[PDB]
Amino acid sequence: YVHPTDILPSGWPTATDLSGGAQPRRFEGTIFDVMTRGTIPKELHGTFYRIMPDYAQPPTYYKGGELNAPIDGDGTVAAFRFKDGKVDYRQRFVETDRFKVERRARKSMYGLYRNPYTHHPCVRQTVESTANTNVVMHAGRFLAMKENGNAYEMDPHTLKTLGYNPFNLPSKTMTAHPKQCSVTGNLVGFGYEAKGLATKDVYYFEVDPSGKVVRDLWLEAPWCAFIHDCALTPNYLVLMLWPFEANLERMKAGGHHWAYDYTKPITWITIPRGAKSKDEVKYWHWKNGMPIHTASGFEDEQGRIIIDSSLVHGNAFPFFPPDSDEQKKKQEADGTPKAQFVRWTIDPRKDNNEQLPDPEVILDTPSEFPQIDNRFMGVEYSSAFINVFVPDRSDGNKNVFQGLNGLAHYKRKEGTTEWYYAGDNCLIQEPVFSPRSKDAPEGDGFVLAIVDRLDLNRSEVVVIDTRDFTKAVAAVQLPFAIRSGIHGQWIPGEVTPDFETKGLVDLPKEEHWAPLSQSPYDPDA
Numbered sequence: 001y002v003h004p005t006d007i008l009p010s011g012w013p014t015a016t017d018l019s020g021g022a023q024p025r026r027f028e029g030t031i032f033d034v035m036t037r038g039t040i041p042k043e044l045h046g047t048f049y050r051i052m053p054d055y056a057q058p059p060t061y062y063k064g065g066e067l068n069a070p071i072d073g074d075g076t077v078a079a080f081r082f083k084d085g086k087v088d089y090r091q092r093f094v095e096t097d098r099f100k101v102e103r104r105a106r107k108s109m110y111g112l113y114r115n116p117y118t119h120h121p122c123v124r125q126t127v128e129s130t131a132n133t134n135v136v137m138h139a140g141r142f143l144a145m146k147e148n149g150n151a152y153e154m155d156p157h158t159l160k161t162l163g164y165n166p167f168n169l170p171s172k173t174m175t176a177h178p179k180q181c182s183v184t185g186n187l188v189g190f191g192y193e194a195k196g197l198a199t200k201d202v203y204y205f206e207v208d209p210s211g212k213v214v215r216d217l218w219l220e221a222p223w224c225a226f227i228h229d230c231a232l233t234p235n236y237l238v239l240m241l242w243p244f245e246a247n248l249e250r251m252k253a254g255g256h257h258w259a260y261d262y263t264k265p266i267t268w269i270t271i272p273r274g275a276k277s278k279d280e281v282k283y284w285h286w287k288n289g290m291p292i293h294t295a296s297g298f299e300d301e302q303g304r305i306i307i308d309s310s311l312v313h314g315n316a317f318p319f320f321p322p323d324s325d326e327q328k329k330k331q332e333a334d335g336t337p338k339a340q341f342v343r344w345t346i347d348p349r350k351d352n353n354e355q356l357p358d359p360e361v362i363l364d365t366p367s368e369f370p371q372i373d374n375r376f377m378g379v380e381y382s383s384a385f386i387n388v389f390v391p392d393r394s395d396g397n398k399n400v401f402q403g404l405n406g407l408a409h410y411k412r413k414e415g416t417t418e419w420y421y422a423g424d425n426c427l428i429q430e431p432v433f434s435p436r437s438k439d440a441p442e443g444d445g446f447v448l449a450i451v452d453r454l455d456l457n458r459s460e461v462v463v464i465d466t467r468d469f470t471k472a473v474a475a476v477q478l479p480f481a482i483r484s485g486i487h488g489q490w491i492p493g494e495v496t497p498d499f500e501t502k503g504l505v506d507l508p509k510e511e512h513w514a515p516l517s518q519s520p521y522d523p524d525a
Ligand SMILES: COc1cccc(C=O)c1O
Pocket: 053, 070, 071, 072, 132, 133, 146, 147, 228, 486
């Protein structure tokens, strides 16, 4: 059966998200008192903010949009606010400069990811960021982030866009993966390509809880590398280099910003915290592969840097292939890489010119978007909450971003892993942790994540108590599906300005519109 209206032409290209999903969503608005199944824990007090790519206009500017990447689309923030067991929701697009241009124009004006040479001539010198990767609340300011620009600030209640680069960073970029130190409260981070397209410059920074840059350093990466994420320790920021290289002449020629390079080893840059000289920075190397996201890092008793990450044994973004015909054929040959969760040891007593030890396999299954208990950010941690391909219950052939159908709770100290399965014909997104109370043990609390009910065309938020990780306590049930997203964060009420007085939805007025005389009811009747 085919419905005659279904063969009518769309002017939309295939606009995928990371999951492989291709349905544009693009709504902006609210639901007060989201339908829930089961009981919402009264211990949740805060907001789960999630950010997705969801092109607002059909991205047809360059080559009819046929090369749009899953990481490209205009950032939209879904907020799910948990107060006294009620849950409200708000979604709104980040009003990036790019968004504004395209909405006002009713027209795509931007080309390839990170390639201004493929943007419309009138926009080439704009901030090209779609601000669609990650969010943070720092020094009372709520930020949407993408690594090709500074952050945009938004109002945390209305999600109205307030401004660009609120912390006034001197770099042209900020990572979407800054870390908030649990000891100092510093937003610790960096920005690479810090001086413009294909620059090797990195700028390291620490922003104190008052919003001031208290520490910074300019340095360079050994090549212009895709430095997506990092790990924070008490004495280091550690930058994680993926084996992609940027090339200006390739960009000028209308090619991709990045090209995977099998010959590049995974490389780490140790930046001593508050370093006085770029002389203090070291490069460490292993072998080729793609560690996507760190869980976190710390320094062990002997001062060794321990980091856990996912590890994909090859290219997890095949839409950015190698330059050479030779490496192109190797990517095709390799198909879907081996995918695991691994532990790295960067011992600063050793010569950084020596190849790193092979990382230890922690989980031998496809693993991604890890989070921790943030009360342990930048110090020793045990808990990780990992998005996973469930062992024996998942495809295997799927790209790492496209078959994530469970979660894992790993605890290094106990050496145990517990597992949550999203369901048949379901996918589950990145987990976030909220502690049971202020003083609860590490990883004691509630884990939330978005579930795609693929057979129902709707999305839901599952809530799981760490005392039984196998089972959902509650499910927040949207009446629709939202885009599969990138990162999200549990943001405590206590660090949110005016969380006690402002909901995601403004209440209507108390006063009745109508006079008493209009009531159909007469108490004397
Ligand atoms: C959404 O935009 C992005 C840019 C660069 C890397 C990643 C990886 O998750 C990403 O999601």
